[PDB]
Every structure is written in structure tokens, then in C-alpha cells.
Amino acid sequence: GIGGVPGPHNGLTDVPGVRVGHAGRTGDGWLTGVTVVLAPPGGAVAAVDVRGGGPGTRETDALDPRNLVQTIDAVVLTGGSAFGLDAAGGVAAWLEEQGRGFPVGADPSQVVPVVPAAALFDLGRGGTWRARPDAALGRAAVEAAAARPEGDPVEQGGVGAGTGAVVGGLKGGIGTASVVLDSGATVAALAAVNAAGSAVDPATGVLYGARTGLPGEFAGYGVPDAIGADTHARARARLAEAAEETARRRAGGAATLNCTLAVVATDATLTRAQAQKLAGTAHDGLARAVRPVHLLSDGDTVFALSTGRRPLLPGVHLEAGALNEVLAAGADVLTRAVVHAVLAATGVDTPGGVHPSYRELYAR
């Protein structure tokens, strides 16, 4: 079997043709950004499963399987909560300039780009409340995506939409993971982790998602397999100290909005309804990495994409068996991407928040 191992860079771009671009702003009151996932020319089949309704989503109805538009070119993940939906307008503008979208005239230039987006809440985490992504920052992210080659490693940690992300008080960020199936298809995920709940078991200090990891994939980040009780006691204390200082700096505790965002992709061919099932099932991966999840503050959104390059099959239900492998992998790559995000993060300390990273607490 060739399956059960990560793709070449262990990330979303291991699905051939997919590109990822980040643009962000840090310093001078800012700590936010945008991440765009750009499908190859011709677009990808796409679907979505939103739990908790943002706020801050755009064009999610267009991805119903009943609807006219058959493929899309870009998904936008952004900071700035609802205001940061403004970034998607800059992505749509770029796509129109490229002639990419739903064709609405005999002239190839006349297109309507369907650009789904979801936002996460990071307001004020740089220090300046009104410092949120705008159209120009969204354009910058999709231009960054377009400038990369196929199969380019994805930057993780405090970049793009992950720049101002926080999970359970710890610094969150962007993370990504992939897996090759025995069929040779690749399933992968990219997450911007910003949840209310914890990625860490409060009894032990172990990352919830770690036991879903593939063998050795986290070795490069340098955390011990056994966490000492004393280390964990000190980490809990430091996190409470950061949380109390954050609440003083924000003149109030922890925001009542979080919102954690993901894209799962595969090159196995899926119908739109199969992609919708994948987006739903991939939420399970989030549950295995973070607890609790899907609270009222958690506007969690997962988009699913298929580039349609490989057939699913290269009292016996063979198609169902093949889809089940993709569905199971979709959850797993999301759990794994959340762990990568938490490990890739480095901590921040600004006038809008003090958020140490997991490794600053547990690897040191």
C-alpha cells in the first residue's frame, strides 16, 4: 500500500493544482491577515458546512448542490470578523481581471466570480480596534497564491488569517496536513485555528489531536512524549497569567466570538453533494483536536474542494467504500492540521493580547 503517509510537503498543496496565498499585517497596532485557497484553472467542485453561522460568511448558499454554479476558483479565510469580509471583494476583482468565474456574456471577459469566504474574530489583538483586512489585503493574498508554483510548501503559524488567531487562550494560527490514500488520491486540510475551546487536555498537557498523528510527523517541533506534572502545572499557571493580563488590556475578558475555519481538498473526483458530505464529516476532525467545539461563540466553517483529477474508483458497494476512505481521511487531516497550527505558532504580546504558544509552555 502507498497510502497512510503524508504527501510531499504534508499540506494542502499536495493536492495537485491547489495554491495557497497569505497576506498579513503585523505591528503598529495590527495583527491580522487573509488566506486564500486558489483552485487550478477551470476551478474546483466546492461545498461547505457551517456550524454556528459566523458571523462573517459570504456566498455559502451558492455552494448548495442544487445551485447553478458548478465550480469555483477561490475560497477566502480572513481575520477582522464580519468587517474582514471586505477582503473577498478584492479577490473577486482579481478573479474578474483573470477572466475566472461564471460566464455571463459571449465575451470571455464577462464573468461573475463566486467567492465564498468566512471570517474569524481577532479584533483589537494588535492593539488597534479598527485594524482589519480590506479589499487590498484580500487581493494581496490571492496574488500571492497565484505567484506560487504547484506543490509549493504552505507557510504555517502566525500568517494570513492565522496571524491574529488564538485557541483556548494559546496562540493559534494556520496549520496544514495531508495523507495519500491507497488509491493514490491525496486528501489534505488547511485550518485557521481560533477556537474558544482548548487544543490541550487540561489534565495532562497533551494535545488532544496528537494521537491522530501519523508516525513521526510532529518530530521536528521538539515536544516530549511525556509531559511532566511540574511542566504542566507551570504551563497552566502561565496561561492563566496571560489570560488575566489579556483581560486587563482589553478592558474585558475573552471575546464572545471565536470562529475556526478550514478547507479540506482532494484530487479524488467528488460530486457537489459528496463534497458537502466531506465538509460535514471533516468537522469531526475539529472535535478530535479541540474540546469543547461548536459552542455559540464558535462560528466554525469547513469548505471542501475536489479538483476532479482522479476517479474515485481507479451486496458490495465499491463506490461507497472509496468515498468512505476520503470521508475518514478528511476528518483526520483536519485534526492533524489543527495540531500543526498549534505547534507552528509562536507567541505574541501586544497591547491587545498576551498569547503564549504551546511550545513556549511545553517544549522549552
Radius of gyration of the CA atoms of the chain, in A: 19
Q: Find the shortest distance in angstroms from Cβ 235 to a second copy.
A: 18
Residues numbered 51-90 forming contacts with a second copy, rule: CB under 8 A = 51
256 binds a second copy (CB under 8 A): yes
Contacts of 58 (CB under 8 A, 6+ apart): 76, 85, 88, 115, 116, 117, 118
216 binds a second copy (CB under 8 A): no
Total residues at interface with a second copy (CB under 8 A): 34
Q: Find the shortest distance in angstroms from Cβ 110 to a second copy.
A: 39
252 binds a second copy (CB under 8 A): yes
292 binds a second copy (CB under 8 A): yes
State how beta strands 74-78 and 117-119 pair.
parallel
Phi, then psi, of 329 in degrees rounded to 5: -70, -35
194 binds a second copy (CB under 8 A): no
How far, in Å, CA of 19 to CA of 68, rounded?
25
Among 140-148, 171-179, 230-238, 277-285, which window interacts with a second copy (CB under 8 A)? 277-285
272 binds a second copy (CB under 8 A): no
Question: What binding mask, one character per residue, do residues 325-354 give for a second copy by CB under 8 A, x or -?
Answer: --xx--xx----------------------
291 binds a second copy (CB under 8 A): yes
Question: What binding mask, one character per residue, do residues 18-57 give for a second copy by CB under 8 A, x or -?
Answer: ---------------------------------x------
Q: In the set 217, 297, 346, 363, which binds a second copy (CB under 8 A)?
A: 297
CA atoms within 13 A on the CB side of 39: 30
Residue 176: all three cell numbers together: 496544514
Q: In the set 276, 281, 306, 350, which binds a second copy (CB under 8 A)?
A: 281
Residue 301: all three cell numbers together: 466553517
277 binds a second copy (CB under 8 A): yes
How far, in Å, CA of 108 to CA of 264, rounded?
30
Q: Which helix (H) or strand (E) holds 243?
A: helix 229-249
Kindly tell me which of 49 and 73 has the beta carbon lying closer to a second copy.
Answer: 49
Residue 128: all three cell numbers together: 488597534
Please classify residue 152 by burial: count the beta carbons closer than 10 Å to its beta carbon, then call 0-12 exposed, 13-18 middle and 19+ buried: middle
Q: In the set 19, 272, 283, 355, which binds a second copy (CB under 8 A)?
A: 283
363 binds a second copy (CB under 8 A): no
Residue 247: all three cell numbers together: 483581560
Q: In the set 182, 211, 314, 349, which binds a second copy (CB under 8 A)?
A: 211
Per-residue exposure over 83-122, b if at least 16 CB sit within 10 Å of its own CB, e if not: bbbbbbbbbbbbbeeeebbbeeeeeeeebebbbbbbbbbb
Q: Interface with a second copy by CB under 8 A: which residues?
A: 51, 196-197, 201, 203, 211-212, 252, 256, 277, 280-281, 283-285, 287-288, 291-297, 315-317, 320, 323-324, 327-328, 331-332
